[PDB]
Amino acid sequence: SAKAISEQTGKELLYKFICTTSAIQNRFKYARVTPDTDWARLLQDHPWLLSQNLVVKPDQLIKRRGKLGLVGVNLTLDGVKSWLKPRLGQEATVGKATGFLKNFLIEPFVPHSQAEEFYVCIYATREGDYVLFHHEGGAQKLLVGVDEKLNPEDIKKHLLVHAPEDKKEILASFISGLFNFYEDLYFTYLEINPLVVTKDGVYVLDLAAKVDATADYICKVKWGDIEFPPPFGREAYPEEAYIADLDAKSGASLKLTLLNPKGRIWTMVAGGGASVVYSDTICDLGGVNELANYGEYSGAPSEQQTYDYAKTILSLMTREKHPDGKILIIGGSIANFTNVAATFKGIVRAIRDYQGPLKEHEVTIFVRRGGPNYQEGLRVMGEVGKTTGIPIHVFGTETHMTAIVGMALGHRPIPNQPPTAGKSTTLFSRHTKAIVWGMQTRAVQGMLDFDYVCSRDEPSVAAMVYPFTGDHKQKFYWGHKEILIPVFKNMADAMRKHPEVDVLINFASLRSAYDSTMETMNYAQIRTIAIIAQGIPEALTRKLIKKADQKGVTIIGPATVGGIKPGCFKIGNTGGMLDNILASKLYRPGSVAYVSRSGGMSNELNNIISRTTDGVYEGVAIGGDRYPGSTFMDHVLRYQDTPGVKMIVVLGEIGGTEEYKICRGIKEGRLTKPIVCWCIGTCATMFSSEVQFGHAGACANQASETAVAKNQALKEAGVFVPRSFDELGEIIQSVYEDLVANGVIVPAQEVPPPTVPMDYSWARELGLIRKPASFMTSICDERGQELIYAGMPITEVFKEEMGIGGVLGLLWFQKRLPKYSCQFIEMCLMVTADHGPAVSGAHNTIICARAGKDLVSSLTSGLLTIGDRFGGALDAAAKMFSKAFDSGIIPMEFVNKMKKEGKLIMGIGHRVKSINNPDMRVQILKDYVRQHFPATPLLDYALEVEKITTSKKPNLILNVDGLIGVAFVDMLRNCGSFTREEADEYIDIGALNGIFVLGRSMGFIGHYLDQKRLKQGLYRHPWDDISYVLPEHM
Amino acid sequence: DLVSSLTSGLLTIGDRFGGALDAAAKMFSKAFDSGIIPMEFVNKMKKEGKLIMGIGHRVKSINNPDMRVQILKDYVRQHFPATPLLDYALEVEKITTSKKPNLILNVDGLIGVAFVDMLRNCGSFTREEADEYIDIGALNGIFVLGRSMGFIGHYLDQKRLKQGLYRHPWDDISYVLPEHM
Amino acid sequence: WARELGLIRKPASFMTSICDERGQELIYAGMPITEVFKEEMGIGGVLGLLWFQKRLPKYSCQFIEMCLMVTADHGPAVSGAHNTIICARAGK
């Protein structure tokens, strides 16, 4: 996408980055004025306003300013002060468009003559860069190749035949320095007129330029935050730059151009060729002034990117009211790989967020869309119409594409019945094998679904290349049979192990497709390369075209879906899912072979040919870039030289002289087959100002490149050209019935294709099958916008200031516990955190840590010691004291009961701390429980048991194991969150086992991390500490 | 029992499950210590054929942020005195969201770069001490101690629901045994 | 019922090659369990079937069993046998 930059930006880019041994003069000598500028800011930032004479230029991408009376030559600062008074902020007219003057550029005047003025122009073509020169400014042509350098020896012989001898060396130092500046910053156009080179040096008086805006990832540092001004007649809007910010942050395309904010016809059309066709049809029926915007989205945007694109569009049309009302066209052709379900779910979400002001403006919405998962995309688009009250009319594949334009403008009625309903000739064959570059498993499965339905013997995909993983095998389907396709880290491993592969389908991104395509041209087996990425710079694409011309390799792309040859081979995602393959009967060859620019119209051309003709022989989308790898003529000629092709359908866009070649291909007699062509983009001439479309190559540099003039040229050469795109269907039909009458087309016998089983997830989503869920969970939901802990979102978990004990109640009990119950749980985890290395579990962690094991294994080896004799006294004492308290007996009888059973009371008895020397962990937790808990009946029972057992020995006190056991039970049945059978269940299933384990896991990890820091070696137990009592010989 | 059931799932934690906290902390600190700009770090890891650990979410991309990331990033900016590794990782995140919107800092990569930022910028640790704790696996223990809470909750859930013994279905298993070898 | 008569396809998330049990006989890497015992391979014979999926020769099978007897135990003082004894003495 070549975007024009201002004179100020290009001159600033020249002064910072040119490498000329001749001294460039008047560097940084520019002043920008606005209708909201201060003259004190000019005189303080730039001190040269009074020192020299001055000239003034309107910097709003205006050419021929010196002939329209907008240039003041040789005026003083005081002279240019009153010069801007009737002009800065007033109207103007350059051709047809009209606009204001918010920008003028003030530069010092140069005393020059007509013999001092030169003219340099460097512009890019497909074959290289043309460098121009004219001696009388106010010509010569040199072609520098794609991978060739413009050396200073070459300017003198060719570009300097009429230059004076005393000025040759200073221009050849400048022109060679200008072309390296042209190449480094990725300029596509660079015109300087006039170029005044006096004896003092080189003066750049004017500079009109266009840079390749897709090369922003290469030249981000050197450009800075470059701004692209709109053409004259249209202003810039902040919501236009919001969509342009979303475009540059992904491989998907998101374009928006606001033609008229007061227009009643708003478009949200999917596809950069579909939106052109919708804009042609709206402008065809007299809606040019009411066409509010041109905008497209393609490249499979996400639900969030489509929501951000839709909610920008919805916010633009709800700012001013219209008496007749406003129309939102949500259109598009049948998609190939764009998920219509995720696309429309973003649009439905945006409409529900904006249902208020769309009732105010009487917005009527017409929807026509097909593609992958389009049934529930159109389903939820029909639901949002009735629950919000917005009149939304939904149509699909069966409806014609631009039918809804006539329904919206009031030209055709509403069909209320069908809603909810060295290049080679043979590139592909039935033995064609491909290597797919990247993880596109759905795209590869679409190819293998195509092959089995086309009754192929072998799958198209032989290998896949993904550089970010090791060599493995990916499981796919050969119909109902599971096969494995090998994945390779390196391309050289894939090409060596698969010598039969002749096609590469390159699914690399825009910043990685250049290096992948030049690497695969080092293998002579690959004859066809398909480049899917859109956004590759035009300078890098020309190097792909140049090396493919040397190696004799066909390139389909860039910015294509690929192509389809029914019965033999399809490229990637072309033709959509298998629902669209069988609907369009793309499993058997027909008679039409078509070529097209966009991949969105190729799936529409699949539908148009299928309903009017016996089928498609071979479809190719060449891509929407400025320089495609293979053009229209490279394929229309392969189609002529193919016996299976009977008629050809060509679909082009505005821009380029490629569709002219067909006329000079037909007039010479090379093409003898009936050709039905149509060039889209007839509304750009009928617009006010120049509009650059979603395609990079959809720019009309000349009046010859316009789609109206190209359609007139093909009409003169005997090509069947309809009046518009909606009349393409019966012109293709009327040619087809003409060749059946002549008998050169005979329709074949229809054979039913081999059907495949339906996908499980696709059958489960729309409810034909039921499959039992083998798992049931209640503690955490993660398949949503937010992580949910037992019905509570993760932001509300942190907002309400619950801690680790708060989320422990959510994960383990699924309850909102009170803040004392949460804080008691955390205090239980700190007192059970560690108890030294001498205990049995901490011993086992240290041995496993000293044996060189990881954190997980060392934790585990000691954590598995926890059980009955180590760490079970919390759960044992809780079960012991609750059983005595529930089966209500006095504490004196409980002590006597357990004595006669020969069992010690669990949770009673310390080794050293007895009485008047209490356990401090017990005294911390007992003080908390008495102050904060509302009622502690089991604690008061256990303290009376403790009073009895300290009458026997002073040591027999409540442990920290028995305190936690009787107070955790007291926390469960006396906090209000739990019933009695619920609190008894959690003790029964082992919640207090988990309290010790989660607490003691902290100290065991700390014991692991301690032994790694101390760097302790492998432990062997001493032999003198082991008593060997082995048998004699048994 | 609780101990065996915790353990059988806790031992899955390692490199592919639960290792992205420790992997991203080692990954971003190595780039920041051997001082290179975040643009060069993204280009360095692309040519080595390795994805950046702690970068990239499945569903939450941009203008729909991860809420666990937004809770912890707001805490770290307000309370930490200096976060040089977080600011490095956020500039790496600015570059990777220019490629796909999904390539944001995970909750694995946020915790990894902010735990390192907590160690060397709280005053308790020296630089060789803070680098040792990351080297011996302190962030492995942070995931393991955290995820042990939910695994015990997953154990206690299945005991309450009284779920029977699980056998995997035979139709979900692809038997590719040899012929007679 | 829909999977049996072939209207849907659902991808198998697991792949195995060492044992087939969904038949009339248990199969160890293509070899039935009766032929395992008929041909007098031992524990080292079924180790070659389960771990390598191969018919190993009788010296290779018998060498595997001899490796398991010499690595069977090396006293209680080693680090692993220490940890087993601690966990056994803790009532596990």
Ligand SMILES: CC(C)(COP(=O)(O)OP(=O)(O)OC[C@H]1O[C@@H](n2cnc3c(N)ncnc32)[C@H](O)[C@@H]1OP(=O)(O)O)[C@@H](O)C(=O)NCCC(=O)NCCS
């Ligand atoms: C070509 C296409 C399919 C693949 O691109 P994508 O899905 O956007 O991106 P990828 O999966 O290649 O990854 C994008 C980048 O993210 C990087 N990335 C992914 N995960 C990462 C991680 N965890 N850490 C760091 N980087 C990561 C990848 O390395 C890749 O880097 P690179 O672009 O510098 O090589 C996509 O661009 C597309 O859909 N294009 C539109 C198709 C089209 O133009 N058709 C038009 C005619 S119909």
Ligand SMILES: CC(C)(COP(=O)(O)OP(=O)(O)OC[C@H]1O[C@@H](n2cnc3c(N)ncnc32)[C@H](O)[C@@H]1OP(=O)(O)O)[C@@H](O)C(=O)NCCC(=O)NCCS
């Ligand atoms: C006789 C003697 C050696 C043993 O008594 P002791 O050590 O005090 O107590 P014991 O170890 O028997 O245990 C005391 C009680 O605590 C109980 N007990 C111990 N652990 C317990 C636990 N975890 N839970 C509940 N009860 C427990 C025991 O069951 C015992 O109960 P009982 O007395 O009702 O049977 C001791 O009394 C003593 O030293 N006497 C002095 C010797 C003497 O008199 N000599 C004088 C002349 S030189």
Ligand SMILES: Nc1ncnc2c1ncn2[C@@H]1O[C@H](COP(=O)(O)OP(=O)(O)O)[C@@H](O)[C@H]1O
């Ligand atoms: N820096 C300058 N110094 C002196 N004269 C200038 C300067 N810039 C432009 N002019 C005058 O403006 C006239 C036309 O300006 P320009 O914008 O270069 O071409 P046009 O407006 O015809 O496209 C020329 O005749 C030239 O004399």
Ligand SMILES: O=C(O)C[C@](O)(CC(=O)OP(=O)(O)O)C(=O)O
């Ligand atoms: O969304 C759509 O219908 C078109 C598209 O997304 C991409 C596309 O073709 O854009 P283009 O027409 O500019 O080449 C697809 O899925 O093929």
